[PDB]
Design a protein around this nucleic acid. Structure first.
Lengths: 28, 242, 212, 331, 120, 387
RNA sequence: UGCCGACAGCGCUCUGGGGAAUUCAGGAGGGGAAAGCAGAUGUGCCCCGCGGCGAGACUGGCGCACCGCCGGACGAGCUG
């Protein structure tokens, strides 16, 4: 499905910012 | 010499844009230069007080094989004033400037060169002339200037390389309009330098026909630069433009 | 005023020209392709600009000077035809008494003497005027109108310049009583211009749809 | 072109609901005559080759007001059978051809999104926002509206998806960074209202990456302080305020914005006896910032703007107001 | 700067050998000014350039004109040895040879310029 | 059976989903070729999926550098995320159309579920891409800002200059046009000099009869006021103008005492000094440009500046057109730009030719080879003095 | 390249031949045009059927360059 935006995960992690926030949310 | 100061006359030649200036005991070829008043390389030039902004440049054959072709009277040189032309082998830019003065402002010519400092002269002229786009790269890998060259209509080629046919073939595969056109020039001594030159030319034209080209003119620029040729073909149709 | 195209966005420009031009210059600076230079050269560039702008201001005040002086030399001529105009005339003349020596049609054919003697040598048509074209009052007409006003204008130019160079005045003489001659000429020739222009056109048999 | 036959298709699409409206007494013969003629003229000029999204919006509002007027007359006539669904669908077809025709009119994009958000096409609105956001990757307005309606509906994870992708793309302006920190702290305030999240380290982290963002400006950090200073009624608000203050004090030491935040720092959750004491403390900070060696005109413009805001806040003492007037006039 | 340098393994030696052939056979211009004049008359068949020179800028400008004319050139590593190969009693940094269209020397030159074209 | 494709452009880069894509058998055919040619048969072929413009000129430039290398930036990768459905190819994959082989290989490395397809192999996506660059301006106009011609123009200029290091060693345009300016303003200085000279001499001719150095003539007329207000050593002026006490100022005073010319009106004197101030300012600008050209010529061509001198060497390079032109020129060409004098002329022509090619082909130029060749011409002057 | 031009010949054409206005019937070319009806069904819901993503967990057998392969069946969460 390319019809929407499924949410992000470490596979589709783009930058350092995404890495930091995904680290925080995985800690959550 | 048709020395400096001789009053002459200029008229159009057959081709759209190029001009022929006759006079006295010696005629020659000129183009209205876009960049005004200024010479490039000590080429001679021509001014007419129009009834300031009206200046032409003499075109040496022996320096520029396109000029050799215009003297050899080509069938159709495909480059209207205001046309998109990929040049190839744009070494130091003289002939390239001539094509620039042909196509004028509403045209554009993409000048590709391999080496550097001939590039320096080319890009100097590219600063000056506002319709020629400098590209200095390896011609064999045209995906590098794939960012720069749009689809164009006319392909100039004057490199002296063994894989020249395949060079201009992939450049035809990449940058030539449906029903495209091209002029290339060929030296026997750099394609294969023991054979008879006519046979070498037939080998090269058969190559281009294998590159799906339609060979549609050939001439041999005979009293001007021995055992070369200019060859004119059309990209993927029997007629030229559309 | 613009520094470098580096200094494009922070330069102030509207003092010399309106925007919708001086925004497009900032756009052209941003996506321009002129080559990068040094401030050691931009010093020389800007100082040459200083040269030429002082030169242009010099020409401007020079023209203002010459306007004052033309008002001084010939009130009829400057009130009639233009200060720079009479400046061209005196320039060809050599002196004011020199110009007042010449008859009026010759005044009309000052300057263009190359064309004049071309025509006179080959029995071509003769050229129609001189510096009078770039004079103002002929500017408003059309063709034959332009020619006729040029001739009559020249006659009054002759009269007025002889007036300015030969009418003595008690030196408690105002500029307007000195130039009333030329003002007379200006009014009368303006009415001449409007009448010759408003020559009624030529009527015709107006048809119906049957031509009727 | 082929406009006659394409419009023949679309008017044949429009036929049967109008047949229903004529067998109803809701609209008469001349009215429906006028309607079909207008719709034909509309759809013709719509499908004209030389075209413009303004006239597209004209047809849009025309069909919308049609659905409205027919609903009003139906309610006045006490009819229940007729719906609005075919009108919605033909409106959608108008929009669909509009967006395939012009991929360049963001205003018309937002018009489509507003019409969908009003008429309750949830998943459709999500997918259309998806398409247009792929089409224009350079409007923080679009990114913010996406993440904002997601944060409004409550899908905070999808809000994070939209906002995080927008932060990944748009990197010349800090505006969506401001709004993302805004919605993150607003979600945190929503958590505190329904009362990691106990730490609330996400605005800290987004400031950490903003510190090396390409738009990295001192005034940008000042606006970051301003949006952080909004809604100071939280748990770690003093924590993040201290962090941003020490960060910009470490990086821009003598900046007039750093002095402005050194002035306006302890007024996080002020509005009461705690107001004038912090006012006097910040006034001591302000006098120190005034006497310190910074760009005094810049700092004075900052403080006169913020003090005009303070004067816009009512409910103060006249002596305090007059000494603000004096310290404002003395700049 | 002089990136189309000739490699050692006797390639330079066949070069100097053919230089000896053409120097006897009068198909030769010697010295950089002669090289420029020959290539700007277009008679040049090939030109050899020394790299052992007090500053190399001379045999850097000469490749600009041969690039402007599309005729080959090659960097010998020894101006002294090239001058000795020509038989000058003097070191030469630039030697060019033209075409005479009835020989087998031209076949030799065709081979040599094929070699330098494969070098480039 | 392809799904999407990327496209690289001077204004940006995009991707497109092909719907009713092209025959793979039918590719030599006339009708398929004319269908490819006409826009009216190709918009049904290709639909726009998404578009991405450049942020800055350096950004698109580095993008060109990257793609010419074959490697990619993370923001095009971000577009690939932003328009690609996430997967790996454990059951299903996605076909992407890519031109360059390195580029396609790297995208397949970066994403497991994608089969990127390089057109070098694929005649299919090559033909698609050629239709793309065929109508590459008319699938963008509604969303394209401005145009593509000037974009390609500036971008190609910058890419050429980046790869060639253009501005870091081209300055001769400034050099020769500065020379042209100096000659133009110098002759204009001469004309202003003679004009205001005779023009003030109408009022006072003894200033011509005693005074040469027309710039000093201009200084003394801007300082002179009128004919009657003269004193010798008034304030800070004639001491550094000229000899002040016993040589010149007294002679000027007695010339104004024996003076005979027409007294001038005040506004006319104002005109006179306006002209003289203009003359002095442009002569001052000449000396500024003289120092500037000495500095710039020292910076760009030191060997010529020492072997000939900056004014004449700059004359020669301006008549040449460019330092590259000078280098291109042969020796007798440099002649064109007894017998011993012509022999020396040829010799110096050789030597300045060599100095020219040296300065044109050193990265950051030096001075010492010009110095040693200056010594060579000095000892050659000595050698010809020995005769 | 100026007019004028007899017979004697050749060329076309002949409801004479020009010139201009003007109606119409055709032609051929050039420039511009997003020029795009490949199968056209309102939204929202959940449920079924089926499909992909997808955390995680396994397992079979092979592997004399030994460094790795290839295959099955379960599966939280997401989606059409």
């Amino acid at each position: 499905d390319a019809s929407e935006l499924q949410p992000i995960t470490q596979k589709t992690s783009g930058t350092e910012l995404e890495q930091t926030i995904l680290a925080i949310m995985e800690e959550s | 010499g048709a020395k400096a100061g001789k009053k002459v006359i200029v008229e159009p030649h057959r081709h759209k844009g190029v001009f022929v200036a006759r006079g006295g005991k010696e005629d020659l070829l000129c183009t209205a230069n876009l960049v005004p008043g200024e010479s490039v390389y000590g080429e001679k030039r021509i001014s007419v007080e129009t009834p300031t902004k009206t200046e032409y440049r003499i075109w040496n054959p022996f320096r520029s094989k396109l000029a050799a072709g215009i003297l050899g009277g080509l069938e159709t040189i495909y480059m209207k004033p205001g046309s998109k032309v990929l040049y190839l082998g744009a070494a130091s830019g003289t002939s390239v400037s001539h094509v620039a003065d042909i196509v004028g402002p509403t045209g554009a010519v993409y000048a590709v060169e391999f080496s550097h400092r001939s590039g320096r002269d080319l890009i100097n002229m590219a600063t000056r002339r506002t319709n020629v786009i400098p590209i200095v790269e390896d011609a064999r890998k045209p995906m590098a200037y794939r960012m720069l060259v749009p689809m164009v209509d006319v392909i100039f080629a004057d490199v002296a390389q063994p894989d020249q046919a395949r060079i201009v073939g992939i450049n035809a595969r990449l940058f030539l309009k449906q029903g495209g056109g091209l002029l290339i020039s060929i030296k026997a001594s750099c394609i294969d330098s023991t054979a008879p030159p006519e046979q070498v030319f037939a080998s090269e034209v058969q190559k281009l026909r294998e590159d799906k080209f339609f060979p549609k003119e050939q001439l041999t620029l005979e009293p001007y630069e021995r055992d070369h040729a200019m060859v004119s073909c059309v990209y993927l149709q029997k007629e030229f433009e559309g | 005023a613009l520094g470098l195209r580096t200094n494009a966005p922070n330069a102030d420009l509207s003092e010399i020209l309106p925007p919708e031009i001086e925004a497009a210059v900032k756009a052209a600076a941003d996506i321009s392709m002129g080559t990068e230079i040094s401030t050691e050269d931009y010093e020389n560039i800007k100082l040459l600009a200083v040269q030429v702008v002082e030169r242009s201001e010099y020409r401007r005040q020079l023209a203002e000077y010459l306007q004052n002086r033309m008002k001084a030399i010939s009130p009829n001529m400057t009130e009639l035809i233009g200060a720079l105009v009479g400046a061209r005339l005196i320039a060809h003349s050599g002196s004011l008494v020199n110009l007042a020596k010449n008859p009026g049609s010759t005044i009309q054919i000052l300057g263009a003497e190359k064309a004049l003697f071309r025509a006179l040598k080959t029995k071509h048509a003769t050229p129609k005027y001189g510096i009078i074209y770039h004079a103002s009052l002929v500017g408003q007409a059309s063709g034959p109108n332009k020619g006729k006003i040029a001739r009559q204008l020249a006659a009054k130019i002759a009269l007025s310049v002889r007036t300015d160079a030969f009418e003595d005045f008690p030196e408690n003489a105002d500029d307007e009583t000195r130039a009333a001659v030329g003002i007379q000429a200006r009014a009368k020739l303006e009415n001449n211009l409007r009448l010759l222009e408003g020559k009624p056109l030529n009527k015709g048999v107006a048809l119906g749809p049957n031509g009727i | 072109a082929w406009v006659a036959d394409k419009a023949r298709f679309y008017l044949e699409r429009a036929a049967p609901e109008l047949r229903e409206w004529e067998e109803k007494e809701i609209f008469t013969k001349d009215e429906i005559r006028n309607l079909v003629a207008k719709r034909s003229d509309f759809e013709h000029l719509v499908l004209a080759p030389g075209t413009k999204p303004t006239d597209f919006l004209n047809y849009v509002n025309w069909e919308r007001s049609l659905d409205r007027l027919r609903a009003k007359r139906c309610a006045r006539l006490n009819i229940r059978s007729v719906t609005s669904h075919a009108s919605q669908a033909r409106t959608f077809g108008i929009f669909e051809r509009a967006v395939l025709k012009h991929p360049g009119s963001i205003e018309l994009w937002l018009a489509y999104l507003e019409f969908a958000a009003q008429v309750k096409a949830t998943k459709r609105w999500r997918r259309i926002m998806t398409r247009a956001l792929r089409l224009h990757p350079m409007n923080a307005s679009l990114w913010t509206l996406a993440g904002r309606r997601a944060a409004q509906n409550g899908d905070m994870q999808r809000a994070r998806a939209h906002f995080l992708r927008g932060c990944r793309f748009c990197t010349r302006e800090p505006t969506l960074w401001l709004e993302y920190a805004r919605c993150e702290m607003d979600w945190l305030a929503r958590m505190e209202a329904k009362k990691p999240a106990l730490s609330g380290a996400i605005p800290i982290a987004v400031f950490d990456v903003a510190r090396k963002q390409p738009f990295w400006g001192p005034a940008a950090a000042e606006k970051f302080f301003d949006v952080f200073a909004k809604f100071g009624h939280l748990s770690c608000h003093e924590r993040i305020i201290s962090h941003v203050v020490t960060t910009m004090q470490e990086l821009f030491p003598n900046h007039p914005c750093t002095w402005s935040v050194h002035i306006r720092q302890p007024l996080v959750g002020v509005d009461t006896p705690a107001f004038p004491k912090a006012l006097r403390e910040s006034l001591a900070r302000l006098k120190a910032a005034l006497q310190s060696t910074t760009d005094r005109k810049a700092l004075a413009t900052k403080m006169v703007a913020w003090m005009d805001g303070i004067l816009a806040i009512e409910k103060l003492d006249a002596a305090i107001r007059t000494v603000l007037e004096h310290t404002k006039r003395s700049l | 700067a002089a990136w189309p340098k000739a490699e050692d393994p006797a390639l330079v030696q066949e070069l100097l050998d053919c230089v000896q052939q053409a120097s006897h056979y009068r198909q030769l211009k010697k010295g950089a000014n002669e090289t420029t004049k020959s290539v700007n008359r277009g008679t040049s068949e090939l030109v050899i350039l020394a790299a052992d020179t007090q500053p190399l800028s001379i045999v850097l400008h000469i490749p600009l004109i041969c690039e402007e004319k599309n005729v080959p050139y090659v960097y010998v590593p020894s101006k002294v040895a090239l001058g000795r190969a020509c038989g000058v009693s003097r070191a030469v940094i630039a030697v060019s040879l033209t075409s005479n269209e009835a020989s087998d020397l031209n076949s030799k030159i065709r081979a040599l310029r094929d070699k330098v074209e494969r070098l480039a | 059976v392809v799904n999407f494709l990327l496209f690289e452009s001077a204004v940006g880069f995009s991707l497109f989903e092909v719907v009713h894509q092209a025959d793979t058998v039918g590719l030599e055919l006339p009708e398929v070729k004319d269908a490819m040619k006409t826009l009216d048969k190709f918009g049904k072929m290709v639909k726009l999926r998404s578009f991405n413009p450049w942020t800055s000129a350096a950004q698109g430039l580095e993008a060109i550098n990257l793609i010419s290398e074959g490697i990619m930036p993370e923001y095009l990768k971000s577009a690939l995320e932003m328009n690609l459905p996430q997967t790996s190819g454990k059951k299903s994959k996605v076909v992407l159309g890519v031109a360059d082989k390195k580029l396609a290989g790297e995208i397949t490395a970066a994403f497991p579920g994608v089969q990127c397809e390089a057109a070098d192999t694929s005649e299919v996506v090559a033909a698609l891409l050629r239709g793309i660059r065929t109508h590459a301006n008319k699938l963008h106009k509604s969303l394209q800002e401005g145009d593509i011609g000037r974009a390609q123009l500036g971008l190609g200029h910058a890419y050429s200059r980046a790869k060639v290091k253009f501005s870091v060693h081209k300055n001769d345009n400034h050099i020769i046009q500065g020379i042209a300016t100096l000659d133009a303003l110098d002759k204009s200085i001469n004309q202003g000099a003679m004009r205001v000279r005779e023009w003030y001499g109408w009022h006072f001719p003894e200033l011509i009869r005693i005074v040469s150095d027309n710039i000093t003539y201009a200084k003394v007329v801007l300082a002179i006021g009128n004919k009657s207000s003269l004193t010798d050593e008034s304030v800070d002026d004639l001491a550094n103008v000229l000899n002040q006490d016993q040589d010149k100022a007294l002679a000027i005073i007695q010339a104004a005492k024996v003076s005979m010319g027409q007294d001038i009106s005040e506004v006319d004197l104002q005109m006179v000094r306006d002209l003289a101030s203009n003359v002095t300012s442009m002569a001052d600008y000449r000396r500024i440009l003289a120092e500037s050209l000495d500095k710039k010529m020292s910076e760009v061509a030191p060997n010529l500046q020492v072997i000939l001198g900056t004014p004449v060497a700059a004359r020669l390079i301006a008549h040449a057109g460019s330092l590259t032109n000078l280098a291109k020129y042969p020796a007798s060409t440099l002649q064109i730009l007894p017998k011993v004098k012509g022999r020396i002329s040829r010799y110096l022509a050789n030597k300045c030719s060599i100095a020219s090619r040296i300065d044109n082909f050193s990265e950051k130029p030096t001075r010492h080879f010009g110095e040693v060749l200056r010594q060579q011409l000095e000892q050659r002057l000595e050698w010809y003095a020995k005769g």
